[PDB]
Design a protein around this ligand. Structure first.
Ligand SMILES: O=C(c1ccc(O)cc1O)c1ccc(O)cc1O
Ligand SMILES: O=C(c1ccc(O)cc1O)c1ccc(O)cc1O
Lengths: 115, 115, 114, 116
């Protein structure tokens, strides 16, 4: 998998399960084309989100539905969504891991880029 | 000021100065209307970024040009941009400070919301 | 004020008020000795924590009592405490701000140095 | 593996490899008794740091030598060390992962605790 995620819940100290996310690719005209959507499992990850064939070089946006994550827990969050925008160069089997630490009024997005 | 920012540089241990940002407002049709731009001073802040007349209830987007900040610093950044997206005055009018902690491959967005 | 703090609460999006902390100095022995205490006001700050005379060059440990903070909020924390250890050089009116972002199972420590 | 770590480098976007750490166990008198040391591999993890028998309920301290890490990376760090202190109830196959995100002037410590 060239694009992976790892979401953690900073209130309970567990992975963030059942977070919905969408992957969008920026096109020539500057617009965004949705190319995939998924939901984290109980470990805060998604497997088989997009193939290397679906993941050419270019700018991508990954939108995490963090508001619903907190609302379904009875907490009231600040952010509508968490969006991670980055220029990708999957070359030489270069893989990207988007880590995300969630609190109701704050989140941290970091990237682990390999090969 | 109803909308303040406070950007810090986690590499240098200083406020992030001269960071450019845009403030947008979600519209009825689901698009975005830009309402302001700004650039942080040397304390990492923008004074009088918007006024109360520009700030009715609704969803807003604050887009920080973090990639240009790290390029001018000589570092190579991951993120194309840093986006904070939130519903303003959902339960009534409030004031907002957006705290942002910047590293080349990571950032933390936090909100301080007061009456 | 050569040593300042700013503590935020990431659960409810406010400063963290009434957080107790201890400032310790490292001894030439190798251990710690407590030189001051304080408690954050409603803005997550402590004014007049220590003086420039109490804050000479040297290694310092600031120990934030985050466990008691989350207990008094009704939450279960992970950390027994939040410690920040750094080498201070207040040379040339150089001031330190320890920014601290608190969640029950996580905290971020960062420093702003003039 | 009841006590695991995961360290990342927020500047380069890689795991922080070759970080030294010391595991200490609070004693009845309040002192600390070192019980283990380790160094992260290239994934930012340490495997078989301590056994479940070495890890009874109690207060533990994990000290990460982040000053040496940043110096070797060519950056001047703020912190002398990163210290994670916590009360552990490892009853019923409860595992602790100490997650650590590092920048020269900032770090974030989080914990992931598995269920019994
Ligand atoms: O612990 C984290 C982590 C990240 C990537 C990964 O492959 C495994 C992890 O445990 C982690 C998650 C979110 C964050 O903001 C920082 C982290 O170190
Ligand atoms: O110290 C911070 C801060 C936040 C709000 C404010 O009005 C002033 C501050 O110094 C701060 C804390 C966490 C963070 O991710 C970014 C910050 O600027």
């Amino acid at each position: 998998c060239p694009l992976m995620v790892k979401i953690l819940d900073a209130v309970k100290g567990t992975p963030a399960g059942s977070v919905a996310l969408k992957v969008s690719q920026k096109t020539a005209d500057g617009g965004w084309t949705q190319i995939a959507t998924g939901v984290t499992d109980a470990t805060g990850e998604i497997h088989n989100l997009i193939t290397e064939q679906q993941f050419p070089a270019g700018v991508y946006r990954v939108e995490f539905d963090t508001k619903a994550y907190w609302t379904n827990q009875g907490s009231t969050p600040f952010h509508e969504v968490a969006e991670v925008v980055f220029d990708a160069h999957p070359e030489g089997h270069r893989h990207y891991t988007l880590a995300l630490l969630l609190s109701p009024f704050s989140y941290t997005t970091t990237a682990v880029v390999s090969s």
